[PDB]
UniProtKB/Swiss-Prot annotation, chain A:
Cross-link Glycyl lysine isopeptide (Lys-Gly) (interchain with G-Cter in ubiquitin), sequence positions: K121
Name by which UniProt lists this protein: DNA-directed RNA polymerase II subunit RPB1
Modifications made to the protein after synthesis: The tandem 7 residues repeats in the C-terminal domain (CTD) can be highly phosphorylated. The phosphorylation activates Pol II. Phosphorylation occurs mainly at residues 'Ser-2' and 'Ser-5' of the heptapeptide repeat. The phosphorylated form of Pol II appears to carry, on average, one phosphate per repeat. The phosphorylation state is believed to result from the balanced action of site-specific CTD kinases and phosphatases, and a 'CTD code' that specifies the position of Pol II within the transcription cycle has been proposed.
Further information: Mutagenesis experiments demonstrate that the minimum viable CTD contains eight consensus Y-S-P-T-S-P-[A-S-N-G] heptapeptide repeats. Identical and simultaneous substitutions in a number of consecutive repeats are lethal: 'Ser-2' -> 'Ala-2' (14 repeats), 'Ser-5' -> 'Ala-5' (15 repeats), '2-Ser-Pro-Thr-Ser-5'-> '2-Ala-Pro-Thr-Ala-5' (10 repeats), 'Ser-2'-> 'Glu-2' (15 repeats), 'Ser-5' -> 'Glu-5' (12 repeats), '2-Ser-Pro-3' -> '2-Pro-Ser-3' (15 repeats) and 'Tyr-1' -> 'Phe-1' (12 repeats).
Subcellular location: Nucleus
Notes on the domains: The C-terminal domain (CTD) serves as a platform for assembly of factors that regulate transcription initiation, elongation, termination and mRNA processing.
Curated annotation (Swiss-Prot), chain B:
Gene: RPB5
PANTHER family given in the database record: DNA-DIRECTED RNA POLYMERASES I, II, AND III SUBUNIT RPABC1
Lineage: Eukaryota, Fungi, Dikarya, Ascomycota, Saccharomycotina
Oligomer status and interactors: Component of the RNA polymerase I (Pol I), RNA polymerase II (Pol II) and RNA polymerase III (Pol III) complexes. Component of the RNA polymerase I (Pol I) complex consisting of 14 subunits: RPA135, RPA190, RPC40, RPA14, RPB5, RPO26, RPA43, RPB8, RPA12, RPB10, RPC19, RPC10, RPA49 and RPA34. The complex is composed of a horseshoe-shaped core containing ten subunits (RPA135, RPA190, RPB5, RPO26, RPB8, RPB10, RPC10, RPA12, RPC19 and RPC40) where RPA135 and RPA190 form the DNA-binding cleft.
Name the record gives this protein: DNA-directed RNA polymerases I, II, and III subunit RPABC1
Molecular function as annotated in GO: DNA binding; DNA-directed RNA polymerase activity
Single GO biological process annotation from the record: transcription elongation by RNA polymerase I
Swiss-Prot record, chain G:
Name of the gene encoding the protein in the UniProt record: RPB2
Name recorded for this polypeptide: DNA-directed RNA polymerase II subunit RPB2
Other noteworthy facts: The binding of ribonucleoside triphosphate to the RNA polymerase II transcribing complex probably involves a two-step mechanism. The initial binding seems to occur at the entry (E) site and involves a magnesium ion coordinated by three conserved aspartate residues of the two largest RNA Pol II subunits. Present with 18700 molecules/cell in log phase SD medium.
Organism, scientific name: Saccharomyces cerevisiae (strain ATCC 204508 / S288c)
Compartment(s) of residence: Nucleus
Origin superkingdom: Eukaryota
Family: Belongs to the RNA polymerase beta chain family.
Function description: DNA-dependent RNA polymerase catalyzes the transcription of DNA into RNA using the four ribonucleoside triphosphates as substrates. Second largest component of RNA polymerases II which synthesizes mRNA precursors and many functional non-coding RNAs. Proposed to contribute to the polymerase catalytic activity and forms the polymerase active center together with the largest subunit. Pol II is the central component of the basal RNA polymerase II transcription machinery.
Subunit structure: Component of the RNA polymerase II (Pol II) complex consisting of 12 subunits.
From Swiss-Prot, chain H:
Family that this chain belongs to: Belongs to the archaeal RpoM/eukaryotic RPA12/RPB9/RPC11 RNA polymerase family.
Key words of the record: DNA damage, DNA repair, DNA-directed RNA polymerase, Metal-binding, Nucleus, Phosphoprotein, Transcription, Zinc, Zinc-finger
Gene name for this UniProt entry: RPB9
SUPFAM superfamilies tied to this protein: Zinc beta-ribbon
Note: Present with 2440 molecules/cell in log phase SD medium.
Cell membrane keyword on record: no
Organism: Saccharomyces cerevisiae (strain ATCC 204508 / S288c)
Protein name as catalogued: DNA-directed RNA polymerase II subunit RPB9
Length: 217, 214, 56, 98, 56, 287, 49, 116
DNA sequence: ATATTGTGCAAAATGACAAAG
RNA sequence: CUAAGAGUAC
DNA sequence: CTTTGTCATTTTGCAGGTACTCTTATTCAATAT
C-alpha cells in the first residue's frame, strides 16, 4: 500500500474491494423468469413495494411482459462492499437503455432485481415466442460476462500483516508492521495503476508478466 | 462524476510520466513541471465544464546542453495527445505532416484506446523523423521507478565504439534488449544503440552491464 | 475404514496416531502410518526421476 | 494378504431365478412413476429389475449364502441411500473372511 | 517416567477435547470460515494445527 | 513343503503373476478438465463372458462447461463417427414420447433440476419424432458406409442389437432393457454434474479384478483355438475346392496349440503384455 | 454397538513377507516395507529336496 | 419449476404469449394441445442450492449399520436414539451441519443454529 | 527331401473462423 | 554373438 | 474483398545415473526342384 496509509486497515479494505474481481454469479442466490402482463403491477406480492416506489418516481408501453428476477445474498452484500445501487448502476450501464432495471433498497428484507427487455417499435410475429429464450440468454451473460468491481483475472484477494525493517528516525531499524495484499491470479498491468497502492513495490510470482510489463532487467 | 474524476487523475499521472520520460531522454524539462500538483493541472489543462482538453495539452521540448554535447545530432521533440477514443488515419496524417514540416526528428503520439492498423502502416515516415506511439493506460505508472528496474543510460556512438574496443566485442556478443521492451520504448532506443545498466548488486555494491538494442 | 461409522471426523478416524513407537500402534494407526510411508516412497521415486532430468 | 482369496466365478442363472421367485419385478414392465421408491437390482452389472421390499430380499439372500445354497464367493451389496442392490458372481474379485 | 507419560496423556486428551469442541462448533455451524477458504478447509486447518501442536 | 501353483515349461518353473485390470459392466462417471468442451463423461466398459469376449466402450458425455448455456448430452455408439444425441438413441430403441424418455432417465417428478438440465437434449432431438426416422439418422452416421438407403434402418438395428450394451443381451426384443440402462447411465452422469455425487474413484479396489492363471490361459487358449479352427476351415475349403481327399490328421496341426501355449508360458509376453509369466523365485521359501 | 462382522485377527492384514517381522507395529512403516523386500533375499533352505 | 407434459401425446409443453387476454398459456409443439399456466414462473436457476442435502432418506434408513447413532432430542418424539449424517450435497463449499432421523417417527431435524 | 517366399505433458505449428476495415 | 524381457542393488 | 487476432486442434519429443543376475528366441508353412 501507499507508505502513508500502510497501517490504515480500512484503507487496505478499500483497496481490496477496489481490485478484487466480483461478478453477479458470486452474489446472485438465484434467477427466475416470470410472466408479468403489465410492467406496472406485479403478480408477485413480495416485491410489490419495489414497483410502487420506482414507477411512482417515474416509456413503459414498449416493455416485454417477460420479467427476469434475480435474488441476491445478504452475506454476499456484506463480506464484499457492494450495494443494490452499485449493482443496478452497473447492469444499467452495461446494458444501455435496452433493459429497464429496478432493484429493492438495501435495508429491505429481500434483495430483488427486476429486469424487462424494452420492445422495439417494429412488430415481431415470431420473436415473441422466442423472447423467453432471448431473456434466458441475456440472463446467462448477465451472470458472468459483466464485472461489478475489480480487475479481470483476479480470482480472490486476501489481506496479510507483514513486518518489515524500516530505518527509525533516531537511526535504528525497527519492526514496522504493514498491511499487504496477496492475490490469486495475475493482472499486473491493470493492478499497478490502481490508486492508493505503492506502484513501485508491486511484485508477482509470474516473472513473464514482470518481464513484459517492467522490462528484461 | 467519479468516472470523470478518475479519468482526470489518470490523465494527470500520464502527463507526469510523459514529462519524466522526456526529461530522462535528455531534453530540458524543469523539475517543477514534473511535480505539477493535481489541482494546478485541473486548473490549467481542464475546461470549466470539467472535461480535460488534450489539444492544448500537447507540447514541445528541446535538448539540454549536456545532451547536445553528448548527442550533437538530435534536435527538438514534439508530444501530442489525441482526443477521440479511436485515432483515425486522417488525424495521424495531420500529426505526421505537422512533424515533418516543423522539422521535429522525434514525435511521441499518446492515444486513448487504440490505433487503426491502416494508420500503423504510415507511422514510419520519411527519415530521420521517427514517430512513437504510447497508450495512456500504459503511461499512468512510470515503470522506471520500480525498484526492480535498474538505471538505464543510453550510450553515444563514441561510447559504444569505446566499449566494443575495450572489451574486444562484436555487435552480437553483447547482451540483447528487444526493441519492444518497456524500458527501451521509454527511452526511445533504436537498433544498434547500447544502454548501460547500473544495478545494485549484493556481492559488490555497484554492477555495470550493457545491452544492445535488437 | 470399515471399522468406523460414517462421517467421523475425530482425530483417530482420520489418521491421528496418539501412541508412540514404544507403545506400539493399533491396527488402524498401523494402516494409516503405512499409507504415509507409501506416500513417502512414491515421492522419492518420482522426485529422483524428475530431478535427474532437470539436472541434466 | 494372508487370508485373501480370488473368486473363480460362477453361473449367475440360479441367483437370477432366486430373484425372480422372491419378488424381483421384471425390467420390461417396470414403470418408475408407479414404483418411485423401488430398489434397482444389479447382477454382474446387468440391471435385471426392481424390488419393492429390498430388506426381506437381502435377508433371504444372506441366509441362502450363509447356508451354502448360494456359492459363498458371491458378493451382495445393498446401498440404501442410492436405493440399489448389486450382486457380483464373476471371477477376479478379491475377498477375505470375517 | 510415569509422571511424564501421564502428562503426555493429559496433553493428548486436552487436544482431543479441543478438536471435539471445534467439531461441535462446526457442526452447529457457529464456526466462521477464514477469509480465502471454505468452512471445511478452515475446520481442517484448525484440527491439524491443534494435533500438530499437541504432538509438539 | 512345496505348494505347487506353477508350471514346468522346458524344465523351468513358471508362475503366472495375477494381472490387475478394471472391472467390466460398471458405469463410471468422471469430471473432465476445464479446457475440454465436455465437462462430465459417464462410461461403461461393457463385456460378456459367455460370448465373443469383446470390449465395447460406451460413453455418455455432457457438452458445455458450467457457465455454458447449450448443455446437450451425447452418446458415443460403436462403429459410429459422431456422438449421437441421447434422445435420438432413445427414439430409435422405440421410445417416441418425450415424457417416456424423461421417465426412463429421471425417476422423480420433483427433481426439476435434472429436467431443466435435460431440456436441451429434447430440444436438440425435437426434429425427429419417429423410431424409423431416428434409426435412419443413426444409420446415416454409420461408419460402414456400405448400406443402401432402405437398409440403413436394419443396419442401425443391428448396431443397436449386437454392439450397443453387449453385456445386457445380444438377442432382440430387449430394446426396453437397453433403453433403461442408457437412462440409468444418463441419470448417473446428471447426478455427478448436479454436484449430488462425487466422481467415481478410479483407485477403489472393489472396482478392480485380478486375472489369475485361469482367465489368462482362457483368453490365450481362446485365441489359439480360434486360430486352429480357422486353419481347419481353410484346409477343408482348399481340399474340397481342389477335390483332394480329406484327412483329420492332416487337418489338425496340434503344434499350433502346443507351441502357442509353450511360447506364452516360456516368455512373459502373453500373445501370438509382457512379463505375465515369470521364472519362479527359489532363493528362499518365503520368497 | 451396531457391528455386523468382526476381524478374525488384525495381524492377518499383512502379507507373507510382512508376517515374518517381529513387532511390526513398533516400527516406522518404510522399515517394514524394506524388510518385506529384503526378506526375499534372505538365505535359508528353499526346499528340503 | 414444476414442468408438465401434454396429455395427448406425452410430449413437453412450452410457454406461449396470448394477445386476447394477455396471459401465459402452455402449448404443445407437435399436436397443439393448449392449457392455462398454473404459475407465472417459467424458469428457475439455483446458484446456491439447498435441496439434495437430505436426499436418500428412506423409511428403512435406520437399518443401515454404517450410519452413526446419537441420543439427541427428537423435537417430535423427545426420543433419544436416532441416526445422523452430514449434508449429502457434495459441493466442496457446503457446511458441516448434521442431519438427524428419528428411528421411531422418521422426522428429519438439523443441528443448525442460525436457522433456529 | 530342403530352399524360398507370403502416454501425458506442454510447447510449437497449423488450420478454421467470426470480427473488422 | 545379437536382441527382447523379467527380477534386483545403491 | 482481404486481413487479423483468435482459439481449437494437431504434431511431437521426452521422460535420473550407475551396476548385477537369468531366460528365451532367432518367420511357419506350402510348393517345387
Ligand atoms: Zn401433445
Ligand atoms: Zn421422533
Amino acid at each position: 500500500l501507499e507508505p502513508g496509509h500502510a497501517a490504515d486497515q480500512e484503507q487496505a479494505k478499500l483497496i481490496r474491494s477496489a481490485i478484487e474481481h466480483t461478478t453477479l454469479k458470486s452474489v446472485t442466490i438465484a434467477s427466475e423468469i416470470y410472466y408479468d402482463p403489465d410492467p406496472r403491477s406485479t403478480v408477485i406480492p413480495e416485491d410489490e413495494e419495489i414497483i410502487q416506489l420506482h414507477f411512482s418516481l417515474l416509456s413503459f408501453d414498449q416493455q416485454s411482459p417477460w420479467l427476469l428476477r434475480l435474488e441476491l445474498d445478504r452475506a454476499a452484500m456484506n463480506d464484499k462492499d457492494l450495494t443494490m445501487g452499485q449493482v443496478g448502476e452497473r447492469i444499467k450501464q452495461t446494458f444501455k437503455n435496452d433493459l429497464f432495471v429496478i432493484w429493492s433498497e438495501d435495508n429491505d428484507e429481500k434483495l430483488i432485481i427486476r429486469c424487462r427487455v424494452v420492445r422495439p417499435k417494429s412488430l415481431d410475429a415470431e420473436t415473441e415466442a422466442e423472447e423467453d429464450h432471448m431473456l434466458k440468454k441475456i440472463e446467462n451473460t448477465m451472470l458472468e460476462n459483466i464485472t461489478l468491481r475489480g480487475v479481470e483475472n483476479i480470482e480472490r484477494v486476501v489481506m496479510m500483516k507483514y513486518d518489515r525493517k524500516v530505518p527509525s528516525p533516531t537511526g535504528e531499524y525497527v519492526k514496522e508492521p504493514e498491511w499487504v495484499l496477496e492475490t490469486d491470479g495475475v493482472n499486473l498491468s491493470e493492478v499497478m495503476t490502481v490508486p492508493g497502492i505503492d506502484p513501485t513495490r508491486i511484485y508477482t510470482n509470474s516473472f513473464i508478466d514482470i518481464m513484459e510489463v517492467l522490462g528484461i532487467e | 462524476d467519479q468516472e470523470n474524476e478518475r479519468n482526470i487523475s489518470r490523465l494527470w499521472r500520464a502527463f507526469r510520466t510523459v514529462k519524466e520520460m522526456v526529461k530522462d531522454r535528455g531534453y530540458f524539462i524543469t523539475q517543477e513541471e514534473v511535480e505539477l500538483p493535481l489541482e494546478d493541472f485541473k486548473a490549467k489543462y481542464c475546461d470549466s465544464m470539467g472535461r480535460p482538453q488534450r489539444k492544448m495539452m500537447s507540447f514541445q521540448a528541446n535538448p539540454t546542453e549536456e545532451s547536445i554535447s553528448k548527442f550533437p545530432d538530435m534536435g527538438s521533440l514534439w508530444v501530442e495527445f489525441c482526443d477521440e477514443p479511436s485515432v483515425g488515419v486522417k488525424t495521424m496524417k495531420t500529426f505526421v505532416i505537422h512533424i515533418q514540416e516543423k522539422n521535429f526528428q522525434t514525435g511521441i503520439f499518446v492515444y486513448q484506446n487504440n490505433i487503426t492498423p491502416s494508420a500503423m502502416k504510415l507511422v514510419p515516415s520519411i527519415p530521420p523523423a521517427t514517430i512513437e506511439t504510447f497508450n495512456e493506460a500504459a503511461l499512468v505508472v512510470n515503470i522506471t521507478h520500480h525498484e526492480l528496474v535498474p538505471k538505464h543510460i543510453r550510450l553515444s556512438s563514441d561510447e559504444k565504439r569505446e566499449l566494443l574496443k575495450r572489451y574486444r566485442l562484436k555487435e552480437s556478443q553483447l547482451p540483447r534488449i528487444q526493441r519492444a521492451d518497456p524500458v527501451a520504448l521509454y527511452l526511445g532506443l533504436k537498433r544498434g544503440e547500447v544502454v548501460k545498466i547500473i544495478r545494485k548488486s549484493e556481492t559488490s555494491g555497484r554492477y555495470a552491464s550493457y545491452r544492445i538494442c535488437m | 475404514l470399515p471399522h468406523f461409522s460414517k462421517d467421523d471426523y475425530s482425530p483417530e478416524s482420520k489418521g491421528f496416531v496418539e501412541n508412540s513407537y514404544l507403545r506400539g500402534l493399533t491396527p488402524q494407526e498401523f494402516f494409516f502410518h503405512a499409507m504415509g510411508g507409501r506416500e513417502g516412497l512414491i515421492d522419492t521415486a518420482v522426485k529422483t526421476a524428475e530431478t535427474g532430468y532437470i539436472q541434466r | 494378504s494372508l487370508m485373501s482369496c480370488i473368486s473363480v466365478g460362477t453361473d449367475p442363472m440360479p441367483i437370477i431365478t432366486f430373484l425372480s421367485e422372491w419378488g424381483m419385478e421384471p425390467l420390461e414392465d417396470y414403470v418408475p412413476h408407479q414404483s418411485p421408491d423401488a430398489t434397482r437390482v444389479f447382477v454382474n452389472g446387468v440391471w435385471h429389475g426392481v424390488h419393492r421390499n429390498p430388506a426381506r430380499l437381502m435377508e433371504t439372500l444372506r441366509t441362502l449364502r450363509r447356508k451354502g445354497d448360494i456359492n459363498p464367493e458371491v458378493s451382495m451389496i445393498r446401498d440404501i441411500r442410492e436405493k440399489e442392490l448389486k450382486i457380483f458372481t464373476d471371477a477376479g474379485r478379491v475377498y477375505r473372511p470375517l | 517416567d510415569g509422571p511424564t507419560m501421564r502428562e503426555i496423556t493429559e496433553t493428548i486428551a486436552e487436544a482431543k477435547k479441543k478438536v471435539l469442541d471445534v467439531t461441535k462448533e462446526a457442526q452447529a455451524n457457529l464456526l466462521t470460515a477464514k477469509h480465502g477458504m471454505t468452512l471445511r478447509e478452515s475446520f481442517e486447518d484448525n484440527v491439524v494445527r491443534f494435533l500438530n501442536e499437541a504432538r509438539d | 513343503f512345496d505348494m505347487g501353483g506353477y508350471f514346468i515349461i522346458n524344465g523351468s518353473e513358471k508362475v503366472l503373476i495375477a494381472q490387475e485390470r478394471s472391472a467390466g459392466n460398471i458405469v463410471q462417471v468422471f469430471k473432465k478438465a476445464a479446457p475440454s468442451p465436455i465437462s462430465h463423461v459417464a462410461e461403461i466398459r461393457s463385456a460378456l463372458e459367455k460370448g465373443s469376449r469383446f470390449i465395447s466402450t460406451l460413453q455418455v458425455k455432457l457438452y458445455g462447461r458450467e457457465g455454458s448455456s447449450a448443455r446437450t448430452i451425447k452418446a458415443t455408439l460403436p462403429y459410429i463417427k459422431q456422438d449421437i444425441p441421447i434422445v435420438i438413441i432413445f427414439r430409435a430403441l422405440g421410445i417416441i414420447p418425450d415424457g417416456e424418455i424423461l421417465e426412463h432417465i429421471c425417476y422423480d417428478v420433483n427433481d426439476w433440476q435434472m429436467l431443466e438440465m435435460l431440456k436441451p437434449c429434447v430440444e436438440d432431438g425435437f426434429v425427429i419424432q419417429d423410431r424409423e426416422t431416428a434409426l435412419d439418422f443413426i444409420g446415416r452416421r454409420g461408419t460402414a458406409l456400405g448400406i443402401k438407403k432402405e437398409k440403413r434402418i436394419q443396419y442401425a438395428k443391428d448396431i443397436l442389437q449386437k454392439e450397443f450394451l453387449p453385456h445386457i443381451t445380444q438377442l432382440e426384443g430387449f430394446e426396453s432393457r437397453k433403453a433403461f440402462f442408457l437412462g440409468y447411465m444418463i441419470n448417473r452422469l446428471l447426478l455427478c454434474a448436479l454436484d449430488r455425487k462425487d466422481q467415481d474413484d478410479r483407485d477403489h479396489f472393489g472396482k478392480k479384478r485380478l486375472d489369475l492363471a485361469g482367465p489368462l490361459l482362457a483368453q490365450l487358449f481362446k485365441t489359439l483355438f480360434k486360430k486352429l479352427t480357422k486353419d481347419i476351415f481353410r484346409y477343408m475349403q482348399r481340399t474340397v475346392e481342389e477335390a483332394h481327399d480329406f484327412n483329420m490328421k492332416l487337418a489338425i496341426n496340434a503344434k499350433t496349440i502346443t507351441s502357442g501355449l509353450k511360447y506364452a508360458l516360456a516368455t512373459g509376453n502373453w500373445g501370438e503384455r509382457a512379463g505375465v509369466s515369470q521364472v519362479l523365485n527359489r532363493y528362499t521359501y518365503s520368497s | 454397538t451396531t457391528f455386523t462382522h468382526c476381524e478374525i485377527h488384525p495381524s492377518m492384514i499383512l502379507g507373507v513377507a510382512a508376517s515374518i517381522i517381529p513387532f511390526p507395529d513398533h516400527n516406522q512403516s518404510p522399515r517394514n516395507t524394506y524388510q518385506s523386500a529384503m526378506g526375499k533375499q534372505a538365505m535359508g533352505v528353499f526346499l528340503t529336496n | 419449476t414444476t414442468f408438465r407434459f401434454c396429455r395427448d401425446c406425452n410430449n413437453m409443453l412450452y410457454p406461449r404469449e396470448d394477445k386476447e387476454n394477455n396471459r401465459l398459456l402452455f402449448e404443445c409443439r407437435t399436436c397443439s394441445y393448449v392449457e392455462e399456466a398454473g404459475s407465472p414462473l417459467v424458469y428457475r436457476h439455483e446458484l446456491i442450492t439447498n435441496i439434495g442435502e437430505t436426499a436418500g432418506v428412506v423409511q428403512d434408513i435406520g437399518s443401515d449399520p454404517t450410519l452413526p447413532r446419537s441420543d439427541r432430542e427428537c423435537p417430535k418424539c423427545h426420543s433419544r436414539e436416532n441416526v445422523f449424517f452430514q449434508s449429502q450435497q457434495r459441493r466442496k463449499d457446503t457446511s458441516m451441519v448434521l442431519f438427524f432421523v428419528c428411528l421411531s417417527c422418521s422426522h428429519i431435524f438439523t443441528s443448525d443454529q442460525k436457522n433456529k
